[PDB]
Structure formats: structure tokens, C-alpha cells
Amino acid sequence: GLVPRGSHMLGDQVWKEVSSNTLRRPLIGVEKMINYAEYYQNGNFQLTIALSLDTNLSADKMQERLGLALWTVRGYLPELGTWTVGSSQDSTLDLDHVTFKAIQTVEEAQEWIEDTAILVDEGTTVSEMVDLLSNKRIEPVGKQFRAYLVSQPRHGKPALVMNASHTLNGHRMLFQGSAILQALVDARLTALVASSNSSREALEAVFVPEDISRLARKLPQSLNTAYADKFRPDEADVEAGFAKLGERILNSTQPTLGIPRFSTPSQNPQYTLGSANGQPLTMLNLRRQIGVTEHRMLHRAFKKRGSSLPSFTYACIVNSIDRRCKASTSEADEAPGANLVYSAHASRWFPAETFMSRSPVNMAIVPGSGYVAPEELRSKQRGRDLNESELFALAKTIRAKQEQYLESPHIISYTAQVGDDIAAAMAETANKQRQAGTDPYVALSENSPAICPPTLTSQGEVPIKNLYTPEGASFDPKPKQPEYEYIYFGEGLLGGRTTDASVCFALWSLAGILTLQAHFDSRFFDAQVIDTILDDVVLQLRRSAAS
């Protein structure tokens, strides 16, 4: 047992001790680009997810357990305590690293708990909390994760609402939320609360100073180092990555249809979620939800027709954008194509063990690209007004182009250098905009293209245990008035944040419920048009599944 199995050389060493009880590693790849965008673009990409709860726990029980449950989860998920904004010794800002401070005292632990396990004030609903959190950046900048318990809403079910930086997160939020819900019904925690006269006294009974020597192996690594450890890219693989970059750059310059942004940001936006702090809530998440039964039937119907739910949804988005906006980067009368902007998850090439406990990859985005030719998205008979057969053909074309682009993991090879260059250029652009006195919303839009190309990322259903009892997590169905404590989630809500002048569509599923949503700032795009596109897509999905 002296020769460990597997390939883990880089991942075993990325986190280094930089000071007492403090680990640090450099950010590499997409995670570095995200960290810079969150700092310089007001929290761009940050995530809010609400898990709506059925439970027989009172609000008071959930409130008195939340902080200790979070503390317990932190013990095996130190990723919750990472930080991405620091300074060098010359005092200059440092966005290039992630750090982890191992907590040594009860006082320090209690401070982290109170900053991270928030009890939401009476009345506020779950939907209101997702609106609020998605409409601002996480503070203080550098904080990676915060949990909000909505246990006293004036109507509706309670929820666990998580707000996270995207730098080291994504899919992982569901696993983090699941761990918190499981901890909330652990009998040992219930007994601890029952045996203690304050939450700090409960913490004192269990607290152990955190140990960097053993926690390093549980902290997340960049996808880039996991990629190097698994694939050991050689010169030809590196050059293959550059070829995928060149294809993506080319696709971004070819004539494309898309959604036109406003030439200048609206000073009086009418489409808001209310106001907070005297300013309107213009970050919108326009959602279309499809329930368990209909989702199952749609997924089957498209498969039976030789198609797929995600590829047909993409075809409908492309075609609706074309018909509703009639906007393209073609400087002539020529019909445009469509530049496809989308992400893939690294699980397409990496096994499940890459995303577990040992040096996990917690942000597994791999950028995709593709380009639909004008002849593939217009009909010689109908022009833009594609019939059902022509939409199925467009879906097939999209699916084939994505499968071709995503065949190889070596896309990842280009992202370290591109990440460095994009990050450096971001900081330089921000500096130039500050020197120019540019208005912040002008700064967030002036470098965005005039035409936003069709941007859809799809995530298929991944089974997650969503029932929690004192025996642990399980896939069993929601119980009907059991004798034992339980928490169950059958529905989630996503609030995405897109602060630059783009429109991002997301198709995803949780507990069998499918959501198609668009997130964007209504200061840059007409929300009526986006709502019309979403309605068009859902109507066509329903029509073509019934055909």
C-alpha cells in the first residue's frame, strides 16, 4: 500500500502554507477570469440558489441549529471558508490567488458562523430573497459562500438560500446545500442544542482548532491542474487547445444573428423587481418552469423523434431570436449565421471521482463554441419562419456542432494563458475607465458587442438525495407526516447575475422540475423581447412534443 493509485501529483501540492494556519494557491484558468470579473464587473457570474423545504421542523428549531450545522459542514467542506481577494506586501490588490485561513479559536469560529449562517428577518419571502441577492455583489468582496435561512416568510414554504461566488462553485452549491440540510436533522446536533444554553457554549463543547495539514487535501483545485494530472498534455495536445481557441475566436467574428442591446444604458428602467437602497432592482431572471410530469414526457418525446430536449431548445432560442429581433452583425443584406456561446461541464471527460472530496474541482466550466451556417438556420421556402421539420434539422445541426467541438478535453489547455491575458486586460480596461470617469453601467456595456449571440447552457438532471432524516440523506420519497424529523426539497430557484450587456439563457433541472430562464440587466435589453422569446420556446417545445 506504499504506491498510491491514480495520478495526483499537482493536486496533492497546489495548496501551500503561506503563514501560520493559512493555505494559498494560485487561480488558474476560467476560475481566474471569474474572480477578476466578480471584482471589476460588480459580481458578474455570482450565483443564488434557493432550496424550497418541506419539513416538520419549526422555524425556531431550524434557526437554533443553522449556525452549528454550518460549522459542522465546514469541518468536511473547508471550501466554504476560502477567500479570493487579498493584497501583496506592497499593499497592492491581489486577485490571483485563493486562500484558506484555518480557524483557531471559538471566538473566530463564532464570528465566521454569524457572518455565514444568516437568519432572514420576518416576512421576507424566498422569491424576494433570490431577487435581492442576485441584484448585488457578495460583500465583503472575496467572500465565497453565504447561507440564508428563510424560515419566517409571510407566505410560502421556508427555504435554504445560498449565495456564492462562481470562482470556486457551480454544480457544487447543491452538494453544499444538501450537506447543510442533512446536518440540520442530525441527532447529535439536536442533542447538543438541547444540552447548551447558548450557541457559543455549544460550539465550545465541540470546537477543535482547524488543521491545515489535513485540510489541504479537501480544498478545491483548479480544473486546469486536474486536467494536467489526468491527461498529461503533450505538445500536440497544447496545440490542439490553441486550435479550439482559434475556432472560438473565428466563430465570434463571423456574421451572427442575436439580441440587440440598447446603444446606451437606460437611465429610467421600467422592468424591475422593486427597489433596494434607493436603487431599482434591474437584474432579471425570467423563468419558465416545467413540472416533473411534463418534463419527463418532453424529454422522451424529443428522444423518440431523434432529437434532444437541450438541442431542440437551442434551435428554438436561435430561431426565436432571429424572428423576434431580426438583428445581425451582417454589414450587408446577406443572411447571417449564429455564433453559439455555451458552456460544458468537465464531467463529459472526467470521472465522478474528480468532483468529490479529494482535491475536488468545484468549478468545472469548459467554454464551448460553434457556428451555424446561414443555410442551416434559414429556409429556402420560409426564410426565418422555420417549420417543425426545419427546427428539428436545426437542432440536429446544433447538437452535431457541439459534439464535434467538445470531443476532446484539450480545450482546457488554452484556458490558463487565456485566463491570464483576459484577467490582465480586464484590470487594464477598468483602470482606463476609472481614469476616463466612465459611468459604471456605460463601463459594463461599452465593450459588450452590439448584438448578443444566442447563449444557452444546458445541464441535465443529476440525481441528488433530497430527503434528510436523522438517518442521513436518501432518495426515498417525501414522507407523509412521519414520527421522525425530516427535511425534503422538491423545488429550487436559481438567480443568475449577468452585469455586462449580455443575455444568458440557462436550461436546468432539479428534483425533476425543468426551468428555462434568462438572466440579464434590464438597463441593457428590452425585457419584453426576452419574455416573448421564452414564451416562443416553451410553446414550440409543447407543440413539437405533441406532434
* 162 within 8 A of 49, measured Cβ to Cβ: yes
Question: Is the preceding peptide bond at 140 cis, omega within 30 degrees of 0?
Answer: yes
Instruction: Tell me the C-alpha distance between 186 and 69, whole Å.
Output: 9
Instruction: Tell me the C-alpha distance between 37 and 306, whole Å.
Output: 39
* 218 within 8 A of 358, measured Cβ to Cβ: yes
CATH number at residue 45: 3.30.559.10
Q: Any residues with CB less than 8 A from the CB of 525 and at least 6 apart, and which? A: 259, 261, 262, 452, 501, 503
User: Is residue 516 in a domain?
Assistant: yes
Per-position DSSP letters for 163-202, written without gaps between them: EE-STT-STHHHHHHHHHHHHHT-HHHHHHHHT-SSHHHH
Q: Which three cell numbers stand for residue 141?
A: 468582496
User: Is residue 520 in a domain?
Assistant: yes
* 54 within 8 A of 132, measured Cβ to Cβ: no
Q: Tell me how far CA of residue 378 lies from CA of 199, 321, 401, 505, in angstroms.
A: 64, 13, 17, 22
Instruction: Tell me the C-alpha distance between 447 and 249, whole Å.
Output: 16
Q: For residue 176, which amino acid is it?
A: Q
The Cβ-side half-sphere exposure at 87, using a 13 Å CA radius, reads 4
* 87 within 8 A of 212, measured Cβ to Cβ: no
User: Is residue 477 in a domain?
Assistant: no
Instruction: Tell me the C-alpha distance between 24 and 354, whole Å.
Output: 20
Closest CA to 170 of 463, 535, 457, 469: 457
The Cβ-side half-sphere exposure at 483, using a 13 Å CA radius, reads 0
User: Is residue 466 in a domain?
Assistant: no
Instruction: Tell me the C-alpha distance between 229 and 450, whole Å.
Output: 40
Q: Which three cell numbers stand for residue 427?
A: 484590470
Sign of the dihedral through C-alpha 64, 65, 70, 71? positive
Q: Tell me how far CA of residue 97 lies from CA of 18, 39, 80, in angstroms.
A: 12, 13, 16
Q: Are residues 243 and 201 in the same domain?
A: no
The DSSP code for 306 is T
The C-alpha angle 530, 534, 540, rounded to 5 degrees, equals: 140
The DSSP code for 454 is P
CATH number at residue 347: 3.30.559.30
Q: Any residues with CB less than 8 A from the CB of 348 and at least 6 apart, and which? A: 366, 406, 409
End-to-end CA distance of the chain: 59
Q: Are residues 200 and 76 in the same domain?
A: yes
Q: Are residues 270 and 418 in the same domain?
A: yes
Q: Which residues of 451-472 are buried (b: 16+ CB within 10 A; e: fewer)?
A: bbbbbbbbbeeeeeebbbbeee
Instruction: Tell me the C-alpha distance between 223 and 210, whole Å.
Output: 26
The C-alpha angle 164, 169, 171, rounded to 5 degrees, equals: 110
User: Is residue 490 in a domain?
Assistant: no
Q: Centre a 10 Å sphere on the Cβ of residue 247 and count the other Cβ atoms it contains.
A: 16
Q: Are residues 135 and 264 in the same domain?
A: no
Instruction: Tell me the C-alpha distance between 35 and 166, whole Å.
Output: 8
Dihedral, CA atoms, 441, 443, 445, 447, nearest 10 degrees?
180
The Cβ-side half-sphere exposure at 243, using a 13 Å CA radius, reads 11
**Angle subtended by helix axes 527-546 and 388-405, to nearest 10:** 100
Secondary structure element (H or E) that encloses residue 492, with its range: strand 487-496
Q: Are residues 320 and 400 in the same domain?
A: yes
Q: How many distinct structural domains can be found in the chain?
A: 2
Q: Any residues with CB less than 8 A from the CB of 410 and at least 6 apart, and which? A: 231, 233, 237, 238, 240, 241, 244
The C-alpha angle 454, 456, 457, rounded to 5 degrees, equals: 155
Dihedral, CA atoms, 468, 469, 473, 474, nearest 10 degrees?
-90
Instruction: Tell me the C-alpha distance between 284 and 290, whole Å.
Output: 19
Q: Which three cell numbers stand for residue 218?
A: 479537501
Q: How long, in residues, is the chain?
A: 547
Domain boundary among 177, 212, 247: 212
Q: Are residues 120 and 36 in the same domain?
A: yes
How would you write 84-138 as a 3-class SS string? Answer: CCEECCCCCEECCEEEEECCCCHHHHHHHHHHHEEECCCECCHHHHHHHHHCCCC
Instruction: Tell me the C-alpha distance between 534 and 547, whole Å.
Output: 20
Domain boundary among 172, 190, 212: 212
Secondary structure element (H or E) that encloses residue 518, with its range: strand 513-521
* 71 within 8 A of 113, measured Cβ to Cβ: yes
The C-alpha angle 411, 415, 420, rounded to 5 degrees, equals: 165
Q: Are residues 129 and 275 in the same domain?
A: no
Domain boundary among 162, 183, 212: 212
Instruction: Tell me the C-alpha distance between 234 and 338, whole Å.
Output: 33
Q: Tell me how far CA of residue 384 lies from CA of 257, 286, 380, 527, in angstroms.
A: 11, 25, 9, 22
Range of the domain at 54: 16-212
Query: How was this structure obtained?
Result: X-ray
* 466 within 8 A of 178, measured Cβ to Cβ: yes
Instruction: Tell me the C-alpha distance between 365 and 263, whole Å.
Output: 31
Instruction: Tell me the C-alpha distance between 379 and 400, whole Å.
Output: 19
Q: For residue 465, which amino acid is it?
A: K
Q: For residue 185, which amino acid is it?
A: V
User: Is residue 78 in a domain?
Assistant: yes
Q: Are residues 379 and 267 in the same domain?
A: yes
Q: Are residues 300 and 387 in the same domain?
A: yes
Q: Are residues 70 and 129 in the same domain?
A: yes
User: Is residue 179 in a domain?
Assistant: yes
Q: Which three cell numbers stand for residue 14?
A: 497546489
User: Is residue 473 in a domain?
Assistant: no
Q: Are residues 295 and 155 in the same domain?
A: no
Per-position DSSP letters for 389-400, written without gaps between them: HHHHHHHHHHHH
Strand partners, 43: none
* 145 within 8 A of 170, measured Cβ to Cβ: no
Resolution in A: 1.5
Q: Are residues 421 and 330 in the same domain?
A: yes
